[PDB]
Symmetry: D2
Subunit: 248 residues, 4 copies
């Protein structure tokens, strides 16, 4: 009788915080991961010790290819195989790196458009076809319109994800599936980023001059899936401490 | 120890539901009203019966005039006089009626621009000057696809978007968050014939029904909560996908 | 036979460059002004030297008041008085100054909301009522969603002006009146501003690291009034060298 | 001397009107085509009869694949081969069809995202890499935020194209390359009746007019902007 959720890229960072929070709210969770096998199984162990048989892992490369549909179909099936249901999909996995206009370009396209947009489209297709408070939450980007220089493919992927969010909200509304987004500004900074670079970004945030915690992101996801957002579809909630309001 | 909130136009409909849910959440409330005295008083009595001394009413006309700043200062002051603190301001009161391009026009300007934008700005000023603090402005999900011949109403709601953004930016250093909730079709006019209500209800993708006032209130409750501590300058549509629907 | 245009705040700076370019294009012009009497008359003299009887001035305060509707009515009337028609309204006049949240406030409201929004609405009403290629161009602000801090009332007026542009495009389209906007980022900087602060802003602009000329702004106005924009209504053209794309 | 432009999907409809108008303004043009060879050539004949050796054709499939980057590089190369320069890129080519959520799906991806967004990105890269009034114009969609039901992949591609427009305007501004969009609405009678401005479709020429403005010296300060050419349609509530 407990609902079940899929969170993609859930081994670590924001995805983990979302799977933890959904699990604390009473969901059964599929922890999807790609390379972070040890971190995924560790998380699943932690959740299962809290309530047995409530977390499973599922490995998949979400790069675009001719087998991406089957991989997306398999992630959703994993939720139905473990739990008998799939109530919520959180499209959280993301590739993020520069692609200057001035890895083959075709691999960059597949990872950056694949993970950020095509895999959410296919997961959304599979989640809908395999079908109560059903919804999807896409992890978007509050700075989509003021993009980092030399990030065109990543920015294109996140814009396409805004498109998907709106299109799928429209199309799936008659089936009672809501589709919303959460758009972080700066949250957990890159592990490879030096402290001095971190602090440059921190200093730009009006609300408290610091990045969002992973939990702060997850809070907005939890709202969107809850009974308190039952009329909300096609909405993208920024969780950016005002960063997107700040001019150059 | 309990926080306090001001809700403008709180006697009826959406404002009432906001006031109720804030009260249920543990807030003391100033129920602002303009003409609906008997409804505002009945709400305050209902709330005070639940928890003594947790609701007061405050009457004020929020039409723009040279007395508006003093009116808006008095509303915020009443919250401090009643409760010793003011944690939350909800700018909900609104005039809404058509102003075709083809009451004097200056009265229309004072009502539609004053209630929807100037009074929120003056209230926001008074709230900040007197300081989990936050302001929620009731915006309009259809602001970019507006009702025909509603130009002043639409200008006031666009201005409120600007206020939401400008005040989030300027008040973030004081730890005051500023957000909006943007209904699509929520509670319909009482007099509107069912056949007309149904024309609008049928356009809504999610459930072919309008939002209840409580569903609008739920987004306000989220925004003022510890769960939105990092959210400022955001406007959450609560519209069942209505604004995504093309002509 | 020559069309006629009203330009508000046309004595100086951007509105003057609009008036000039409209006149160069074949229009007869009403040069509206408030305080810049010598500048206004001097402009009308220059245009009239070039084609006699093609320019008049019209004085008015565009601050909100109970007589504002009459003043806006009189501006439109002046165009019909001088030229027998009124084909184009350019809403260019603007008050701009800070109003920190933390002159009386009701004067600030009257000025910043009156000039930027109410006078445009009233001028639009008067234009439409007194009524080919008819159109209205509103001067907006490309930075409306990334506001200068402490400019709430200004930013509110300009957001209202976007609402007006869309509402009036919708309502006046059946009358053949197109309604569009032109949104400068940094163009001619304040007389009062120090050269160091001017260079700070110029440095932020991606395209050329400089402010827009007034003529670059006028060029977009000229497009939107022309026969090459006959299917364009409700659009706002940013003329800001990419400034609004730049993150904090 | 005379500037040169590449227009993708230039054989018919909006891209043809665009090539014609740029040619009338004094550009030399590369008329790109996929399937419409006879049309591309007929247009080329009409422009060269007007002014000899000012119009060439270029065949390429703009579907995403392992060979798309070569194809896009070759389109830009064709401009430089024929004309010695490439001043203007118009990304007009587009695939358009529904992809319900409830051709393999990955061929749909390749066409809807490849032609509408990835080709524009690779063409932008090639245009920029090969470089006094340089600009790119992307043909966007005025209804991007109020999409047709069951057109998710198309809509995703057009959103990605908005992102490309903004990212490339930012990144290429230092090179003096401006990057802007034109967003048509409708350019059958059911639709035309909804249009506030005279309840008719945009002609292709009205779309071309906005392109012509954006590439002109009257737009030398405009970058990152998307001009709706939709008769007000995007303003109309449901
Ligand atoms: N962090 C921020 O400040 C910020 C800012 C804006 C937007 N966002 C968005 O917020 C969400 C969460 O952010 P985040 O920093 O937590 O994400 P992240 O750490 O950058 O990535 C999350 C996970 O994505 C998975 N992933 C990457 N490439 C993949 C592929 N090819 N196939 C399958 N999975 C793949 C990875 O899983 P494995 O580790 O298992 O390989 C990674 O752990 C993302 O959608 C991101 O775009 C974040
Ligand atoms: N209902 C919808 O579908 C919908 C759609 C979009 C946006 N909204 C927005 O959501 C909010 C709540 O909507 P609603 O339908 O519940 O509001 P409403 O019933 O139209 O108005 C709310 C209250 O505003 C107060 N008010 C009106 N004119 C005033 C004035 N001159 N001075 C002081 N107070 C005044 C009135 O108080 P008294 O009764 O005490 O005189 C009224 O009861 C409003 O901001 C509205 O614009 C609603
Ligand atoms: N310059 C920029 O970078 C920039 C940036 C964003 C937006 N804009 C917008 O673009 C337009 C033109 O810019 P600008 O810098 O040329 O404007 P401006 O010089 O700041 O103002 C233009 C004129 O507005 C008139 N005006 C001001 N208060 C008035 C009142 N109460 N009644 C009647 N007229 C009044 C003044 O006329 P008198 O001189 O006759 O008193 C002034 O010369 C404006 O709408 C502005 O908001 C400009
Ligand atoms: N018409 C409208 O109302 C409207 C509305 C919104 C947006 N738009 C946008 O405006 C632009 C032009 O509109 P339109 O209606 O003229 O376009 P269209 O006729 O739908 O298509 C334009 C051209 O794109 C080319 N194309 C299609 N698939 C291709 C592929 N896989 N590889 C290479 N080329 C391919 C075709 O060239 P070949 O013929 O050579 O095969 C076609 O003639 C497009 O970007 C469109 O998305 C148009
Ligand atoms: O780790 C980051 C921070 C990074 C970031 C860094 C600095 C400023 C800013 O607005 C955003 O944004 C990301 C986007 C996608 C993603 O998967 C990870 C990140
Ligand atoms: O009663 C309404 C419904 C009305 C409405 C009616 C029909 C469709 C729609 O999008 C909105 O919107 C309002 C806006 C402000 C307000 O104070 C009240 C209302
Ligand atoms: O003089 C300016 C520049 C000024 C400005 C100054 C610095 C940055 C920026 O984006 C804009 O904006 C204005 C807005 C209205 C107006 O009437 C005049 C100005
Ligand atoms: O022919 C159309 C019309 C079609 C259309 C049809 C009806 C309503 C509407 O907003 C758009 O939009 C297109 C988008 C891409 C494209 O290549 C062609 C078209």
């Amino acid at each position: 009788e407990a609902p079940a959720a899929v969170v993609t890229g859930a081994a670590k960072r924001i995805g983990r915080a979302i799977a933890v929070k959904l699990h604390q709210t009473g969901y059964r969770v599929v922890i999807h991961y790609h390379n972070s096998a040890e971190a995924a199984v560790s998380l699943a162990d932690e959740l299962n010790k809290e309530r047995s048989n409530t977390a499973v892992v599922c490995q998949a490369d979400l790069t675009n290819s001719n087998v991406l549909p089957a991989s997306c179909e398999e992630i959703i099936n994993s939720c139905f195989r473990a739990f008998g249901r799939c109530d919520v999909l959180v499209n959280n996995a993301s590739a993020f790196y520069p692609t200057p206009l001035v890895k083959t370009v075709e691999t960059q396209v597949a990872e950056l458009i694949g993970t950020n947009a095509i895999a959410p489209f296919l997961l959304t297709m599979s989640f809908a076809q395999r079908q109560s408070n059903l919804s999807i939450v896409n992890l978007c980007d509050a700075m989509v319109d003021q993009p980092c220089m030399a990030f065109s493919l990543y920015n294109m992927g996140k814009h396409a994800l805004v498109g998907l969010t709106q299109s799928a909200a429209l199309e799936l509304a008659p089936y009672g599936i809501r589709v919303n987004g959460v758009a972080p500004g700066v949250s957990l900074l890159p592990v490879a980023m030096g402290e001095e670079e971190k602090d440059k970004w921190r200093r730009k945030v009006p609300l408290g001059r610091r990045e969002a915690s992973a939990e702060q992101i997850a809070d907005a996801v939890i709202f969107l899936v809850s009974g308190s957002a039952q009329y909300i579809t096609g909405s993208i909630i920024k969780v950016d401490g005002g960063l997107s309001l700040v001019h150059a």
